[PDB]
Enzyme design. Structure first.
Site, mmCIF file in Angstrom:
data_model
loop_
_atom_site.group_PDB
_atom_site.id
_atom_site.type_symbol
_atom_site.label_atom_id
_atom_site.label_comp_id
_atom_site.label_asym_id
_atom_site.label_seq_id
_atom_site.Cartn_x
_atom_site.Cartn_y
_atom_site.Cartn_z
ATOM 1 N N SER A 48 0.788 -1.244 0.000
ATOM 2 C CA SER A 48 0.000 0.000 0.000
ATOM 3 C C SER A 48 0.826 1.303 0.000
ATOM 4 O O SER A 48 0.375 2.322 -0.534
ATOM 5 C CB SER A 48 -1.035 -0.003 1.152
ATOM 6 O OG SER A 48 -2.238 -0.720 0.824
HETATM 7 C C1 LIG Z 1 -2.292 -2.101 0.916
HETATM 8 O O1 LIG Z 1 -1.386 -2.729 0.382
HETATM 9 C C2 LIG Z 1 -3.379 -2.900 1.650
HETATM 10 C C3 LIG Z 1 -3.758 -4.182 0.866
HETATM 11 C C4 LIG Z 1 -5.251 -4.334 0.565
HETATM 12 O O2 LIG Z 1 -3.029 -4.326 -0.362
HETATM 13 C C5 LIG Z 1 -4.607 -2.121 2.168
HETATM 14 C C6 LIG Z 1 -5.114 -2.766 3.471
HETATM 15 C C7 LIG Z 1 -4.567 -1.843 4.525
HETATM 16 S S1 LIG Z 1 -4.276 -2.306 6.115
HETATM 17 C C8 LIG Z 1 -5.127 -1.276 7.277
HETATM 18 C C9 LIG Z 1 -4.129 -0.608 8.225
HETATM 19 N N1 LIG Z 1 -4.844 0.500 8.856
HETATM 20 C C10 LIG Z 1 -4.230 1.346 9.492
HETATM 21 N N2 LIG Z 1 -3.557 2.012 10.268
HETATM 22 C C11 LIG Z 1 -4.302 -0.664 3.968
HETATM 23 C C12 LIG Z 1 -4.165 0.638 4.613
HETATM 24 O O3 LIG Z 1 -3.025 0.996 4.973
HETATM 25 O O4 LIG Z 1 -5.180 1.360 4.791
HETATM 26 N N3 LIG Z 1 -4.181 -0.808 2.658
#
Ligand SMILES: *C(=O)[C@H]([C@@H](C)O)[C@H]1CC(SCCNC=N)=C(C(=O)O)N1
Length: 435
Positions: A179
């Site tokens: 991400s």
């Molecule tokens: C990014 O690479 C990922 C994945 C779907 O590929 C998405 C999922 C998340 S994880 C949530 C973490 N939250 C926060 N502090 C994220 C994101 O960073 O929002 N992207």
């Protein structure tokens, strides 16, 4: 070895504190190397060993520390002429002990127990490496022993440890950015003329062109509840399909070019420690391009490279060359060398950097808030990354204060993604920096 241990090797320092020094003993080899905060600073000092030689700054700045450096030749003459016990020179690092210690401590407690991974802190306007943390780490006092069997046993234990604690993960290993790489896909689109208000698919799923393979949001849910979403909205909520669509619309050449502009596939300058090269990958087809856009396929970055991306945006679009050594002293404490900061390249316009900053300030607000700092605005990008053929990695890149940044960080927690961990680590490092 006998004679080079009869002269007092000089000090590796951080913030006027000792990271490595030598003590006069009754040993056959007179001087024993001592590391007073061993695991914490091992990525910075390395080791200095009778049996296994040196690594990191012990090896890089060996001529200064042992006193053999050409620039020290006069001191060596004067000492011998006068009768004074000789001493090597000093290496003053750019490491801030408060920030290094906060990075280490946060890594030892942040995974309900110790995390495996890396923390890097940079000063965006200078390129100073303010912290260089790897976990798990090791104790260089073990390899400084004058006992051959103690050294051989330690060397063997370290080399058979599957967690590989000798590895400096901050600069020697590359990881899929996941991400966090949307920062690059976003920068590329903004530079090609797309705007934050541009509309992108909110669909839970997206086909990859030229294959039966398919990509999806987390974890199969639509980005909005509307047909499409704005670029800013897809950025701050980290939707995948929108970015697969954005990146393929932007095309391979623009993505490659922005990746190189941000230091990927570009041979890193020593710090003086050598940094593994980061890559965007070949991107041989359009399936690959969709996967590259969201930080997967063949994209691999060092934690340092990811901290530099954040520092470049923080510094208005200009990359400062990262360096670890502020100055070199002689045994008297006279200045032999002072490092002067250097602008490596402009990656993006002040306008694009400003736009990326706004989006990242928005992404931080959406994020889990554990460890947030009152009255301090943080710009960030959290993320996960899949690897191998397994629990995903956890990333956090950030800079603060977003308005006039003093620090940029990258946090990587190997296997740390849940279904949160990286961000509180990042914020403790930032908070320690802004104290
Ligand atoms: C990014 O690479 C990922 C994945 C779907 O590929 C998405 C999922 C998340 S994880 C949530 C973490 N939250 C926060 N502090 C994220 C994101 O960073 O929002 N992207």
């Amino acid at each position: 070895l006998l004679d080079e241990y009869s002269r007092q090797r000089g000090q590796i320092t951080a913030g006027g504190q000792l990271l490595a020094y030598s003590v006069a003993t009754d040993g056959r080899f007179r001087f024993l190397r001592v590391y007073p905060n061993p695991e914490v600073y091992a990525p910075v000092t390395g080791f200095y060993s009778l049996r296994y030689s040196s690594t990191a700054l012990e090896r890089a700045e060996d001529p200064i520390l042992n006193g053999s450096d050409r620039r020290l030749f006069g001191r060596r003459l004067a000492d011998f002429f006068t009768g004074r016990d000789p001493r090597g020179g000093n290496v003053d690092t750019t490491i801030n002990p408060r920030i290094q210690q906060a990075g280490w401590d946060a890594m030892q407690q942040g995974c309900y127990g110790p995390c495996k991974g890396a923390v890097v802190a940079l000063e965006p306007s200078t390129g100073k490496i303010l912290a260089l943390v790897s976990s798990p780490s090791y104790d260089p006092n073990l390899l400084a022993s004058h006992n051959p069997e103690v050294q051989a046993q330690a060397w063997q234990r370290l080399g058979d440890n599957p967690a590989s604690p000798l590895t400096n993960r901050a600069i020697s290993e590359t990881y899929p950015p996941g991400s966090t790489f949307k920062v690059i896909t976003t920068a590329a689109a903004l530079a090609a003329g797309a705007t934050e208000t541009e509309q992108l698919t909110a669909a839970p799923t997206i086909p990859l062109p030229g294959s039966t393979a398919q990509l999806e949001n987390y974890g199969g849910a639509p980005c909005g509840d509307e047909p499409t979403v704005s670029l800013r909205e897809a950025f701050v909520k980290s939707c995948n399909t929108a970015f697969v669509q954005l990146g393929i619309r932007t095309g391979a050449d623009a993505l490659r070019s922005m990746a190189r502009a941000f230091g990927l596939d570009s041979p890193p300058r020593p710090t003086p420690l050598q940094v593994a090269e980061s890559t965007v990958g070949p991107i041989p087809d359009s399936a690959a391009l969709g996967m590259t856009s969201i930080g997967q396929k063949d994209v691999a970055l060092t934690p340092l490279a990811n901290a530099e991306i954040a520092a470049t945006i923080a510094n208005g679009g200009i990359t400062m060359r990262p360096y670890l050594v502020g100055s070199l002293k002689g045994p008297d404490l006279a200045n032999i060398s002072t490092t002067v900061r250097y602008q490596q390249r402009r990656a993006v316009s002040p306008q694009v950097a400003a736009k990326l900053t706004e989006l990242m300030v928005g992404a931080e607000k959406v994020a889990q808030q554990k460890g947030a700092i009152p009255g301090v605005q943080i710009a960030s990008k959290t993320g996960t990354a899949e690897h191998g053929t397994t629990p995903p990695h956890a990333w956090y890149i950030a800079f603060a204060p977003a308005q006039a940044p003093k620090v940029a960080v990258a946090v990587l927690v190997e296997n740390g993604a849940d279904r949160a961990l990286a961000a509180p680590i990042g914020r403790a490092v930032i908070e320690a920096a802004l104290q």
